Write a protein that binds this ligand. Sequence first.
Ligand SMILES: C#CCN(C)Cc1nc([C@]2(O)CN[C@@H](c3nc(-c4ccc(C(F)(F)F)cc4)no3)C2)cs1
Length: 330
Amino acid sequence: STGSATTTPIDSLDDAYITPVQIGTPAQTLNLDFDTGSSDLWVFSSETTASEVDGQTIYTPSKSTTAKLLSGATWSISYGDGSSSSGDVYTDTVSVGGLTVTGQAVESAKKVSSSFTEDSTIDGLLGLAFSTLNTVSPTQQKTFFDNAKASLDSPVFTADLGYHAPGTYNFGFIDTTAYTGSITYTAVSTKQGFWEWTSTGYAVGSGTFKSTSIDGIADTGTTLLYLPATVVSAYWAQVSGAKSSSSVGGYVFPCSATLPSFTFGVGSARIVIPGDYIDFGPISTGSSSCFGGIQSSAGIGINIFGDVALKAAFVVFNGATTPTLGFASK
Ligand SMILES: C#CCN(C)Cc1nc([C@]2(O)CN[C@@H](c3nc(-c4ccc(C(F)(F)F)cc4)no3)C2)cs1
């Protein structure tokens, strides 16, 4: 089997991408944030504290003929920005782009933190990291991809995110029309539960390539590109007036600037992020200070190849017995 679904930016900045997901019988379609950096499928629901729901579409398990309470199971998760959610668990039929998993754990939120309430466009998350990170207790649950894998034509999914435009998540096949050149595959460590890999270095703009190993994770659920402070300083030093602002929380730059590209290494191959992809616009409405798309990982303890990086590439998440990651230009 295969599936294919379109993913769409939630706003003009590509702050996140949402993908429609069918849950239950008859189908209830919710727009979920596919997150290769976590492993829980959780939804706003008829159980979510009413004061914490503000425009989201909710899953109502009592209206699904295929929903079953996973008795005694609870879940609780936090994310890298400090946001969090928790609740109980149902199993139900879940379909993404024509690919169906029966008995998928659907984690129903009883509580969500303020940032989730405030994002009316995100109805929940669909985790695509390794199932060892799933938070369901006392019986840990598998991700949608892990449950689907044995049925797929090939044990893979691909992320083809757009720049200020929709893109595609495919399951079970590689669309050879969606990229240019070849896909370069690189080894993955699952030791932390992430799609963790080692970039071979970087370049700023038209500068020469710096060969250096950068461990990090491929994370579709993180907006920006977080790299070591040395690398990030070398990038922003090329932008007149760019500076790290503790009050804003990262590097800002004059909105009048044209940004240089940023290249990262995948083995002997290179992915080039155009400068425009690094522009996240005014820090507040009307400001002439703009927020940078490349930020330091120093405070978070892990380098994150988030959407800024991934949207410059066609990315293969290969969940074969020995997992790997593939990157192609597009
Ligand atoms: C700090 C630190 C050390 N480590 C935890 C950093 C890491 N952090 C992650 C992620 O938690 C998994 N992938 C990212 C992700 N964030 C979201 C998200 C968050 C908030 C909302 C909102 F604003 F709606 F509430 C929406 C989506 N979705 O995915 C972050 C992996 S490693």
